[PDB]
Each structure stands twice: as structure tokens, then as C-alpha cells.
Amino acid sequence: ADTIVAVELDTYPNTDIGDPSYPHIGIDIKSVRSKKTAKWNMQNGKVGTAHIIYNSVGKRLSAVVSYPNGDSATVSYDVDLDNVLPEWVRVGLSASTGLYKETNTILSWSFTSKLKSNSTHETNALHFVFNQFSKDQKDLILQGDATTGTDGNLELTRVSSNGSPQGNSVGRALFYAPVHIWESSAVVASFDATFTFLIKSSDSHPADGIAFFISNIDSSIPSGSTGRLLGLFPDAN
Amino acid sequence: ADTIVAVELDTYPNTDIGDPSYPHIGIDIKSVRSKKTAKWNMQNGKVGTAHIIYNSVGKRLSAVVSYPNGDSATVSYDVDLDNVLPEWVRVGLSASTGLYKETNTILSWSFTSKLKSNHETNALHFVFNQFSKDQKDLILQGDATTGTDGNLELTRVSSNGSPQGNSVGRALFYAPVHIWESSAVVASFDATFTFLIKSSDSHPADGIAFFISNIDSSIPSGSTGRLLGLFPDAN
Ligand SMILES: CC(C)(C)O[C@H](O)N[C@H](CCC(O)O)C[Se][C@@H]1C=CCCC1
Numbered sequence: 001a002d003t004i005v006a007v008e009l010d011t012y013p014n015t016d017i018g019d020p021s022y023p024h025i026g027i028d029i030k031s032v033r034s035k036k037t038a039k040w041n042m043q044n045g046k047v048g049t050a051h052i053i054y055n056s057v058g059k060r061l062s063a064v065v066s067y068p069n070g071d072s073a074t075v076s077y078d079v080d081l082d083n084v085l086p087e088w089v090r091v092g093l094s095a096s097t098g099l100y101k102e103t104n105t106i107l108s109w110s111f112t113s114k115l116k117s118n119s120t121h122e123t124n125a126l127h128f129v130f131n132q133f134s135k136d137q138k139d140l141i142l143q144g145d146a147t148t149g150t151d152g153n154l155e156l157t158r159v160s161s162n163g164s165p166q167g168n169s170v171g172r173a174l175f176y177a178p179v180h181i182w183e184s185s186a187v188v189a190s191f192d193a194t195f196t197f198l199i200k201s202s203d204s205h206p207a208d209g210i211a212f213f214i215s216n217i218d219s220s221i222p223s224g225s226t227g228r229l230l231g232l233f234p235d236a237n
Numbered sequence: 238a239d240t241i242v243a244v245e246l247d248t249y250p251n252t253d254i255g256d257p258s259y260p261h262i263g264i265d266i267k268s269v270r271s272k273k274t275a276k277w278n279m280q281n282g283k284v285g286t287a288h289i290i291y292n293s294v295g296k297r298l299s300a301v302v303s304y305p306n307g308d309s310a311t312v313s314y315d316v317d318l319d320n321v322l323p324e325w326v327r328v329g330l331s332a333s334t335g336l337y338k339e340t341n342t343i344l345s346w347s348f349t350s351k352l353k354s355n356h357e358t359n360a361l362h363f364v365f366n367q368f369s370k371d372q373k374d375l376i377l378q379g380d381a382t383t384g385t386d387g388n389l390e391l392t393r394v395s396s397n398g399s400p401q402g403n404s405v406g407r408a409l410f411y412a413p414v415h416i417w418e419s420s421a422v423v424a425s426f427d428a429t430f431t432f433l434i435k436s437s438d439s440h441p442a443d444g445i446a447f448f449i450s451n452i453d454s455s456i457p458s459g460s461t462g463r464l465l466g467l468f469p470d471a472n
């Protein structure tokens with residue numbers, strides 16, 4: 001079982017897995033059962049924006065999803081992610097479909113991590129921005145059904161050439177470089193990710209969702225990780 | 238009068254008011270009496286760094302002071318600045334000395350604020366690693382001058398290199414900061430300065446603070462020594 005820290009955009013209410021009875025954002029530490037959730041008025045076929053932020057001083061991971069009509073949901077959780085994450089990690093995006101299905105299209109993705117040790121404004125830092133994904137995107141490690149098509153969009157799960165999503169699909173995009181999320185003597189580690197998405201469905205019950213995740217370097221899509229496990233977890237412990 | 242939010246590097250234990258009995262860092266919302274505080278053993282004459290951090294989603298203002306030897310102190314407060322702060326305000330540095338005195342030298346000051354919404358994102362980043370005699374993007378107040386040594390001297394220093402007593406100075410960024418907004422999914426900022434606090438006297442005073450306030454903030458009077466150039470009295 002890989003280590004996973006994630007912010008999950010859960011579109012399908014699995015009440016078997018302990019998911020509230022509505023779509024929701026959640027914060028997941030090493031389990032699909034969120035540590036904290038908030039109700040999320042998913043808007044069909046609209047372009048949504050997610051922001052994940054964490055600084056290691058206040059030790060609070062936060063997320064906010066928002067749609068252009070003004071509506072948004074926030075969730076936040078307290079943890080020393082240094083306790084739970086390895087020094088070095090990859091970061092990425094995950095999505096999945098089940099019997100219910102939905103476009104898991106990523107239009108934009110950006111990330112910044114910064115390690116500020118004990119000195120004069122000299123920081124280890126990494127910052128990347130993707131607003132156009134391209135067929136051959138050599139700095140993404142695509143896994144599963146994820147393709148970065150020619151439309152400038154990351155499709156984390158399968159889609160027909162006719163705009164209909166495929167069920168039973170799992171996909172993920174990881175930055176190629178490992179990220180220095182922490183190190184022993186590190187007074188401030190902090191990161192933040194934004195991504196824009198289009199989750200659209202002809203279904204009543206689009207499913208399932210998209211997630212920003214951090215896991216160890218040679219993280220692969222774990223088996224039995226589709227639909228409700230959003231490509232992150234092998235099972236639902 | 239002019240609302241304030243500060244992170245104070247308070248070097249002098251003023252129990253006549255509300256400090257703790259050791260030098261310290263604290264988060265001040267409208268009052269010198271820190272809403273939270275942490276023990277901070279400032280290292281005389283050693284160059285240190287301070288990082289203020291805040292995002293409008295988690296509602297937690299955080300701050301950490303560290304020196305090169307590894308040592309650092311941290312303090313956080315849950316607070317929704319959007320509720321305490323005008324949409325538009327200036328940010329700055331402030332410092333003061335009293336009977337006891339020390340250098341309040343700023344070597345570097347940087348600042349980022351970002352206001353997002355539904356890639357509609359307004360932002361303001363600035364960085365000073367060298368201050369110059371003619372810093373037209375700083376509004377200097379009180380005894381603050383931008384020395385010839387490339388540093389910002391918030392309180393008065395001698396031509397010799399020693400500190401004045403009973404001094405109070407502050408540097409504010411010229412441009413007003415849009416610190417939050419109506420359709421603001423995220424309104425976050427973060428600020429580090431590096432500083433050199435030096436005394437020969439056995440107990441230095443009084444401290445340095447990063448602060449946020451309305452656009453027309455001026456030093457309220459007599460806030461020297463224990464009030465760190467920020468609040469009029471000790472309420
Ligand atoms: C929504 C999001 C963009 C994540 O806002 C975060 O607070 N990042 C801001 C700065 C924007 C970042 O994209 O540069 C402050 Se958080 C902190 C900034 C320095 C790097 C670590 C994260």
C-alpha cells in the first residue's frame with residue numbers, strides 16, 4: 001500500500017465507503033475515508049477550479065473547489081505532513097469512473113513546493129504550470145488511462161472521440177521529477193496546487209471524481225483501485 | 238482608528254502589560270497583547286529570518302523565526318483576516334526601542350499576496366534584498382531610514398554603529414495591497430524579512446514586527462518601546 005495524501009473531488013456518494021450522502025471535497029490521509037469532508041454542489045459540464053494549500057508552520061492542509069458562477073466548497077485538516085510523507089515524493093492527479101461515468105478532463109495544473117531552511121531568503125523550490133498539455137508531455141508520467149490529448153487537455157480517464165466518457169476507467173498524471181516536500185532541518189516546507197477541471201455528464205449520477213495526490217516516488221496505480229477508490233487506494237480501509 | 242494585524246518579534250518581557258516573562262513571538266489582532274505567543278530566544282547579533290504565512294481557506298495566520306544554528310520558534314492563530322481587515326491596506330515593518338535598545342536592521346524584505354476567484358488571479362509580489370538611500374517604493378515613518386550599508390534601519394543607529402534609545406520607525410510598501418475581495422476563493426499572503434538585532438546591554442528591547450493596516454496608517458503617538466510602533470496604548 002503506497003503512502004497517499006490526497007484532496008479528493010468525490011462526485012459519487014459511496015455510502016458503503018463512509019462517504020457523506022452527497023458529492024464532496026475531502027482530505028484523505030492514507031485512506032479513502034476522508035479525515036474531513038465538505039458538501040460540494042457539483043455543477044455539470046462547467047469548468048471548476050481546485051486549489052490545495054499547505055504550509056508546515058500552521059500544519060493545516062486546506063482545499064477549495066469553486067465554479068465560475070461563484071459557488072465553492074472548502075475543507076481543511078490539521079497535520080504535520082512531514083510525519084506522514086517521505087522526504088521525497090511525486091505529486092499528481094488522479095481520476096476514475098465506474099458504472100457511472102464523467103469527463104475527468106484537466107485543463108490546467110500548477111504546483112509549487114518550497115523548502116526554506118535556516119537562512120536569508122534562499123529557498124529550495126519547485127514550480128510548474130501546465131495550461132496546455134501536449135501529446136508528448138515528457139515531464140508527466142502518465143499512468144493507466146490518462147492521455148494528454150491534442151486538445152490541450154489532460155484526460156485522466158478514457159473518453160470517446162465523441163465527447164462521451166468511459167466507465168470502468170482509472171488514470172493519473174504525475175510530475176516527472178520527485179519533489180522535495182521536506183528534509184530534516186526544514187523550518188518551512190510548503191506547497192500549493194491549483195487545477196482546473198471539466199466534469200460533465202449525461203448521467204444523473206456522474207462518477208466518481210478527481211484527486212490531487214502526493215505519494216512516494218515510484219507510486220503506481222495500486223490494483224483494485226478504480227471507481228470509488230479514485231486510483232489512489234487498493235481497498236477502502 | 239487604524240486597525241492592525243501584526244507578527245511581533247518581541248525581545249523584551251513587558252509584564253506591566255500582558256507579555257510572557259521571556260522574549261517572544263506573537264500574533265497581534267488589534268492589540269499589543271498577543272492573541273497567541275511562543276517562547277523565542279532571540280540570539281544577540283546574529284542574522285535571523287521571519288516568515289509570515291496566511292491563506293484565507295484555512296484561516297490560520299502562522300509565523301516562524303529562525304536563526305542559522307537550527308533554532309526557531311513558531312506561533313499560529315486561527316483568524317479570518319477578511320473579517321478584521323479592510324479590502325485594501327498597506328503592509329509594512331515596524332520597530333522600536335526604549336530604555337533598553339537594540340539595532341532593528343532589516344537586511345531583506347519580501348512579500349506576496351494573491352487574490353483568486355473563479356486563471357483570474359490578481360497578485361502583488363515584491364522583494365527587497367538591498368535598500369537604497371532613495372527607496373521611492375517605501376513610505377518611511379518615524380526614525381526609519383534606508384542605510385548606505387544596503388540595509389533598512391527601522392530605529393536610529395549611530396554613525397558609529399550603536400543603537401539609539403527611545404526610537405520608533407516603520408517601512409510600508411508604497412502600493413496599497415488588495416489583501417482580499419468579494420469573489421475571492423483564495424486571498425493569501427506570505428512575508429519573510431531577515432533582521433539583525435544586536436545589543437551590548439544585557440537585555441535588549443523592544444522588537445520588530447511585520448504588520449498589516451489600512452492604507453493611511455501612521456505611527457499612532459507614544460507607541461515607542463513596548464508598543465513597537467503599532468498600537469496607541471496597551472489595550
Ligand atoms: C491556491 C494557491 C495558488 C495554492 O494559493 C496558495 O496559497 N499558494 C500561494 C502562492 C501561489 C503559488 O501558486 O505560488 C501561497 Se502558498 C505557498 C506559496 C509559496 C510556495 C509554497 C506554497
Ligand SMILES: CC(C)(C)O[C@H](O)N[C@H](CCC(O)O)C[Se][C@@H]1C=CCCC1
Nearest residue numbers: 114123288347348349362364427428429
Ligand atoms: C516568503 C515568501 C514571500 C513566500 O517568499 C517567496 O518565495 N517569494 C519569493 C520571491 C522571489 C522573487 O525573485 O520573486 C519566491 Se517567488 C519568485 C517567483 C518565481 C521566480 C523566483 C521566485
Ligand SMILES: [Ca+2]
Nearest residue numbers: 010012014019
Ligand atoms: Ca466516492
Ligand SMILES: [Ca+2]
Nearest residue numbers: 247249250251
Ligand atoms: Ca514586549
Ligand SMILES: [Mn+2]
Nearest residue numbers: 010019026034
Ligand atoms: Mn469521498
Ligand SMILES: [Mn+2]
Nearest residue numbers: 247256263271
Ligand atoms: Mn509581546
